Structures are given as structure tokens and as C-alpha cells.
Swiss-Prot record, chains A, B, C, D, E, F:
Cross-referenced SMART domains: Frataxin_Cyay
Stretch forming the signal peptide: none
Phylogenetic lineage: Bacteria, Pseudomonadati, Pseudomonadota, Betaproteobacteria, Burkholderiales
Function text: Involved in iron-sulfur (Fe-S) cluster assembly. May act as a regulator of Fe-S biogenesis.
Keywords: Iron, Metal-binding
BP GO annotations: iron-sulfur cluster assembly
Keyword Metal-binding: yes
SUPFAM superfamilies xref list: Frataxin/Nqo15-like (SSF55387)
UniProt cross-references to InterPro entries, sorted A to Z: CyaY, Frataxin/CyaY, Frataxin/CyaY_sf, Frataxin_CS
Name of the protein described by the UniProt record: Iron-sulfur cluster assembly protein CyaY
Family designation: Belongs to the frataxin family.
């Protein structure tokens, strides 16, 4: 269809925030491989496991694919919420990334 | 009633973004006449046609009046959407302004 | 549960905006006592009356307690709205604080 | 020259913030006439006195003209500061507007 | 050294804004190939020419490489400015991209 | 003097960001005691050590007091920088907090 730049600005800002937090983690005790390609951010942990954060423009969503599964987030009333459970994006990502890093990594707005 | 400054801040920011993009277009190949008076932004293209972007505070809306018609936008879940079709504001305005300028003008958040 | 940092960032920003406006009022003709403790902002007016603005994280709300009563606000479609009447936050607070100060204090996004 | 949209976005946001605060004041005890024309905001107080807030793009400035005089503000290190005294914009405007309204009006970021 | 997330948030936001504007241009009369890889945004115009916008973290800069040359921008007093001429980022990019597209493309904050 | 609300909005936003990150850390493996009183944020780690982040309005600064010492930050060209070394705020705080928690805590804009 037509690009929705209001959606893209918000969704791209999520990818960027995630990348900055990983950069900080990598300054310290972490070694997470990070790749940003198009609208896809791929994190590869030291144990070889992965988390991908990406855009789904057709539903104006941001998605996570992690060891725990695949989760979809829509921006509703000021924040990104899991379309099934309502769980807020950064809290879920923190949970999944901490599981996979074996060392806390704290994502926060 | 009482002024809703949260609405006004968002709606005024739309008018301002539209004006900046037109200013840039006017630095280049365009000659669009721009007038900002109160909460009304009037664009007059070289062919004499017009687009008006204005506020409708009673419904917390931003409106377009263009050759294509009159469209009303409400801020829902992080963006300005056409109250009838759901089309996002800047994508619609891009379409209408490009029709009337005869040369692409690209509005974007 | 888990801290919702997207909610907290927005709600904390309300407390901060309220405090800045009171600081400005206090530079001039006002003498409002202000206390910020945790997620609770307490305003004590010259006549001894009070307004408290605080967070209610379980419902992702910001609350007012004032002479006029207790009001609850949720962030819906870009702004903080009274969960019962729909009244926008800063307009309501302006009303209540002006009643209690006996001199206009203007809160605005 | 060429329009500086980064400057214009910041400077226009000042005009908009000033207008919202006046709108709130006008909901209450004030009757300030407000006119926004192009990049010029004219406030006319009940006593007939005036304050104008406007843009000066050639120096990327925002200016005040008030009873107290004419003051020029540049954005330096995160805020708008008087080019002669360093006084921050909203604090100065609060001072001047309160003088002219005869009733406190509190401008705040 | 250590990742500067305040710099990265601002610089990444430039890349994202540029990409959104190109997306809009591509909805209309343009066909610009866009690739985002790491902190590098590559635009390939219909005539085969290129513009790259990328990060230079060691000096907290954003760079352009275009037909017109290589330009470096630092964030100073609220905006991205050419380190040699002071020209603001989006105005320069508009100039270079319009040269290379042969059809106006308007970048704006 | 007069309250500088442009400074206060930026400085308060630092305190709020720090608090949100600690809240997230506390959802996981951490137990950091957090107290926000006025413009002072006190963090008490499990080993009894402390970090305080607070405002210094007279110089428009944000300060850290940590085991490593006392550091002062001013907002210059888009970010908070150590007035002696130029080190950016969140990178320094990450370093100090990680030292004192004994488990990485990642602060990021
Ligand atoms: Na919303
Ligand atoms: Na700055």
C-alpha cells in the first residue's frame, strides 16, 4: 500500500532502542552479536541462541522471535503491547534476552 | 469547553510539519504559496488549486480540504488516521499535494 | 508484575510537568509547598488545602486527589483522560489548582 | 538561503507552547487576545498592552517584544537563552506577561 | 571506547528519518533503491548514482557521501551542521538527492 | 533565581530514565533499593554501597556520587557530558553501577 511514516517512526525507534541497550551490554560483560539489516535486528547470544526483533508493516506491528516463541506487538494507547496477552514490549524482551544471555540485560523505555 | 493542550500540542505539530516540508519544496523546484493563520494552513499551488490543513478541536481532529475532497483525521493508537478509511495523514496529504503540484512533494513523519 | 517502562516514562513525565509549572508559579506571586516522594507529588496551598498527583501502576493510571475529589486518568489515544468523564488531565488540574490557590495557575502540555 | 527545518521545528514549537498556555489562561480568569499569523504570535492584554513572540530565521532566533523591551533568544545547549543575558526564554516570558496581565501567567517547558 | 547512547539515539534517528522520506518518495514517482545495513544507509538512484548516509561514532558525526562530495555533520546547539560550512543536514541532503534523482525529493525535520 | 524549566525538564528526564532501568533490573536478578526524594535519586546496592543521582540547578547540571567519586554533567550539544573528562552520562553510570551491583546493569538513552 502506502508507507505509514507515523508507524515506521515509532517501530524503527524500538529497533534503535534495542540496539543501543545491546551496545551498552557489549561494553561490559556481554558478547552479543548484533546485525541490523533492513527492518530486522538479529541478536546472537554467546550460547548460539537468537532473538530477532523486526517490523510487520501490514499490521503496524513489531515482532519478537526468541527461544520462548514468536510474539507480536501493536502500539495501543501509548505503548507496544503483545496482541495476545497485553504484555509490554521491553518487559517481555528483557525476560527473553535475560533467559538467553544467562546474565541480566535490562531493556527500558 | 476547556482547551485540551495535549490534543493541541499534537495537532499543532502536524501543521508545523506540513509547513516545514512546503518550505523545503519551495527552496527547490516548487512555488507553493503558504499562509498560516490561527489554526489554518492554506497551500495555494501554481495552478491555483488549494489544500487547507486545519484543526477541528470539538472532535480533537485535524482536517484536510483538497481537490480530492474533505477528510477528517483523529489521533488513534499513535497516529493520525482518516475517520472513514483509516488512511494515515501524511500518506494521504502526499497523495493530494502531489496531484495538485504536478511534481512530487513528499510529506513524512 | 513486571515494570512497564513505557507507561512509567509517560506517567513520570506528567509529575515532572506539574512540578515545573508549580516552580514557575512559585517564582512569582504563589507560595505552594511542593513535595515529590517516590511517585507521589504533594502540593500544599497557602490556605492549607492539598492536591496530590500520583501514579497507579496496576491500571497504568495517573490520579488526582483534590478538594473537588479523586479523579483517575488513563492514557488513551495520545492523552491522559478522566476514566469517568473523559476530561483531559491538565485542564482538570488547572481547574482544581486555581480553585485552591485563589490565583490562576495554568497547567499546559 | 535554504530553510533550516531543524531550527524551524524547535522555534515553531516555542510559539505553539506559548499559545497553549495562553489558551489555558483564557479558560480561566484571563482575557488575552491571541493572533497567530505566519511565524508571529501577538498577545494583546486587557489593558491594551502587547507581547509579540516571533521567529528570526537569519540567526536561528526566537524574539520577544514586550513592554520591558526587545529580547532575542538562541538555542544553545538544549535551551533558548537571551543572547545578551543568558536568561531562559519561558522564565523571561513569564516575567513580562505577568507584568502586563496583572495576574500571574505561568509559562513552562 | 564506550557506546554513547545519547549520540546514537540522535544519529540513528537521522538515518530513520531519511529512510521514511525515501519510502514516501518510492510510493509516488520515484524508484530509489534503499539498503540499511548496520549504521549505513545506501540510496541508489535510477541513474545508478548513489548517496550514503552513515554514522561516524568516533567524532559523534553523521556523514553524507554523494555525487557532490563527502560531508560531515556534528550535532551543535540543537541541530546537525556541516563541520566546515555550517549547512544544516536535511537542507544539504535535499540539495544532493534532488540533483541525483532528477525529481525533487524533500527531506525535512 | 528563576526556575529554568527547559533545564529541569531535561534533568528530571535523566532521573526518571535511571529509575526505570533500576525498576527493570529489580524485576530480574537485582535487589537495588531505590528512593526518589525531591530532585535526588538514591540507589542502595545489595552490598550496602550507594549511588546518588541528583540535580545541581545553579550550573544546570546533573551529578553522580558513587564509589568511584563525584562527577558533574552538563548538557552540551545534545547530551550530558562530564564537565572534566567529557564522558557521557549513561555510559559512566553503567560503569559505576555495574561495579557496585556485581552484576551488569545497563543504562541507555
Ligand atoms: Na496513543
Ligand atoms: Na543542544
Amino acid at each position: 500500500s502506502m508507507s505509514d511514516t507515523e508507524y515506521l517512526a515509532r517501530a524503527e525507534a524500538v529497533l534503535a532502542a534495542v540496539e543501543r541497550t545491546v551496545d551498552v551490554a557489549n561494553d561490559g560483560d556481554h558478547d552479543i552479536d548484533l546485525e541490523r539489516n533492513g527492518s530486522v535486528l538479529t541478536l546472537t547470544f554467546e550460547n548460539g541462541s537468537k532473538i530477532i526483533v523486526n517490523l510487520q508493516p501490514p499490521m503496524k506491528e513489531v515482532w519478537i522471535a526468541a527461544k520462548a516463541g514468536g510474539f507480536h506487538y501493536r502500539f495501543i494507547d501509548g505503548e507496544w503491547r503483545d496482541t495476545r496477552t497485553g504484555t509490554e514490549f521491553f518487559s517481555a524482551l528483557t525476560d527473553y534476552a535475560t533467559q538467553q544471555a544467562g546474565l541480566p540485560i535490562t531493556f527500558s523505555a
